[PDB]
């Protein structure tokens, strides 16, 4: 009885269910792990680059959006880049008209609306992207996930991608001590969280950690390879 209804976004299962959205869900969770906790002083994005190919710098998992906004992607790089274009476009438009940084709580709604739009018209697909949002504004740091179902969520921390349930368990057990921390302890928390997602035989290295920071006066800065070494430094092994 699950015969037809597993093709078209414009088709409901006799189950109160839309198969295509859940398939795109599985698409997102076939991504790679990334963690997005935050503190009062800062919001941080920590992502693990695709350390699966060789002789190939992994894909860029954190994408700059605005002076005050930083995002990470853990799905098809395709729709991710497409949405980042619109991200930057709207941020620049807001800066052009109102001459101010765009608040996060409105940009995320813009994302939700646009991502919902194709879900109704035929011949279109959901945006198969697992997106994480980090930004700082008047009311401080903010963290958001937008699943391809155009359903965003507000978090103090959460992880999306493959094996991310381990990080979600870690964030469950250590969400309490997160709100008040320096930059370095926050980054250590995030690095540990991302580490548990890794296979026990694989350890994080300088090549596949991609911390990014944004704060009060600290504009969104993305930290590439070896530069991050102090951030990795001091971290104990498992």
């Amino acid at each position: 009885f699950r015969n037809q209804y597993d093709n078209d976004v414009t088709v409901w299962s006799p189950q109160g269910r839309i198969h295509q959205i859940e398939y795109a869900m599985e698409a997102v969770k076939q991504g790679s792990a990334t963690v997005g906790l935050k503190s009062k002083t800062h919001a941080v994005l920590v992502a693990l680059k695709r350390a699966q190919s060789e002789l190939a710098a992994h894909q860029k998992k954190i994408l700059h959006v605005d002076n005050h906004i930083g995002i990470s992607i853990a799905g098809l790089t395709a729709d991710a880049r497409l949405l980042c274009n619109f991200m930057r476009q709207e941020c620049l438009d807001s800066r052009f008209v109102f001459d101010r940084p765009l608040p996060v709580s409105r940009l995320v709604s813009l994302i939700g609306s646009k991502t919902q739009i194709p879900t109704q018209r035929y011949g279109r697909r959901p945006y198969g992207v697992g997106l994480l949002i980090a930004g700082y504004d008047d009311m401080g740091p903010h963290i958001f996930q937008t699943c391809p179902s155009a359903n965003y969520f507000d978090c103090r921390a959460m992880s999306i991608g493959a094996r991310s349930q381990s990080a979600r368990t870690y964030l469950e057990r250590h969400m309490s001590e997160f709100m008040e921390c320096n930059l370095n302890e926050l980054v250590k928390h995030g690095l540990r969280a991302l580490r548990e997602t890794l296979p026990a035989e694989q350890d994080l290295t300088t090549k596949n950690v991609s911390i990014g920071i944004v704060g009060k006066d600290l504009e969104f800065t993305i930290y590439d390879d070896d530069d991050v070494s102090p951030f990795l430094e001091g971290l104990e092994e498992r």
């Binding site: 700059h64 930057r88 620049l92 800066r95 052009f96």
Partner: protein, 213 residues
């Protein structure tokens, strides 16, 4: 009928040195025969190394500078690097020419360093034909300013005098003096002076007072 253009006045000056590129503009913003404000600067920082100066129809000035900021952010995002000063000039040329059939009534000068570490000044026309220059004045009193700059910086019409390169202190003194001299014959100059000194270690701002009449 309705006139879409209006002359807000103002003067913009740039000088290129070896490790510096002074940009120079006053803040006397007027319309018709009335002073709107005494403190509207006409030089804007774009990047750590490039500073623009604009004069003329002030509404066009605002629109142009905001769209320039937008394009700077766009280029940064698209190419993961600070946009080069020469690239800035070429982009300004094309964006200004985009309004070929409805010109931005604005005169523009770009102050900044090359990426070889030297000073460079680009001058413009209201439509976008630019050219690299060692020095340039724009705006209403640019007519008064230019010959003196030719005489001193260019050493034009001098004889039997060593062509010493223009040092930072000498350039600073010269620009102060030339605006002081301009203030007494032009009507659109005065009430203040904004000076931006673009160096290799960042940008520092300087300002003095001029004739407030």
């Amino acid at each position: 009928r309705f006139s879409p253009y209006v002359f807000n006045g103002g003067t913009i000056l740039a000088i290129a040195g070896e490790d510096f590129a002074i940009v120079a503009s006053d803040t006397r913003l007027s319309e018709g025969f009335s002073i709107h404000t005494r403190d509207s600067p006409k030089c804007y920082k774009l990047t750590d190394k490039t500073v623009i100066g604009c004069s003329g129809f002030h509404g066009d000035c605002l629109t142009l500078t905001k769209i320039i900021e937008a394009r700077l952010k766009m280029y940064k995002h698209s190419n993961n690097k600070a946009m080069t000063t020469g690239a800035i000039a070429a982009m300004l040329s094309t964006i200004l020419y985009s309004r070929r059939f409805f010109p931005y009534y604005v005169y523009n000068i770009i102050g900044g360093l090359d990426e070889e570490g030297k000073g460079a000044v680009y001058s413009f026309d209201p439509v976008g034909s630019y050219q690299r220059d060692s020095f340039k004045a724009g705006g209403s009193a640019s007519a008064m300013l230019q010959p003196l700059l030719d005489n001193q910086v260019g050493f034009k019409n001098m004889q039997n005098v060593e062509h010493v390169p223009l040092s930072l202190d000498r350039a600073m003194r010269l620009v102060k003096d030339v605006f002081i001299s301009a203030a007494e014959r032009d009507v659109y100059t005065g009430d203040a002076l904004r000076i931006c000194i673009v160096t290799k270690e960042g940008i520092r701002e300087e300002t003095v007072s001029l004739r407030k009449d």
